[PDB]
Amino acid sequence: XXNXXYX
Amino acid sequence: XXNXXYX
Ligand SMILES: *[C@@H]1O[C@H](CO)[C@@H](O)[C@H](O)[C@H]1O[C@H]1C[C@](C)(N)[C@H](O)[C@H](C)O1
Ligand SMILES: *[C@@H]1O[C@H](CO)[C@@H](O)[C@H](O)[C@H]1O[C@H]1C[C@](C)(N)[C@H](O)[C@H](C)O1
Ligand SMILES: CC(=O)NCC(=O)O
Ligand SMILES: [Cl-]
Numbered sequence: 001x002x003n004x005x006y007x
Numbered sequence: 008x009x010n011x012x013y014x
């Protein structure tokens with residue numbers, strides 16, 4: 001993970 | 008990708 005969003 | 012570094 002480590003990324004973010006939101007999709 | 009998804010991992011990091013830095014090499
Ligand atoms: C991770 O490194 C790349 C280069 O490969 C940069 O362009 C990017 O800004 C950097 O990402 C940030 C944001 C993220 C992905 N949510 C994490 O918090 C990382 C550690 O820092
Ligand atoms: C997402 O990350 C930011 C930066 O650290 C925090 O400010 C925010 O609280 C965080 O969102 C929470 C709530 C969410 C979106 N429902 C998920 O549980 C994420 C993983 O954590
Ligand atoms: C070295 C590099 O590009 N790291 C970023 C990733 O792991 O996604
Ligand atoms: Cl992070």
Ligand SMILES: [Cl-]
Nearest residue numbers: 004005006007
């Ligand atoms: Cl999402």
Ligand SMILES: [Cl-]
Nearest residue numbers: 011012013014
């Ligand atoms: Cl690197």
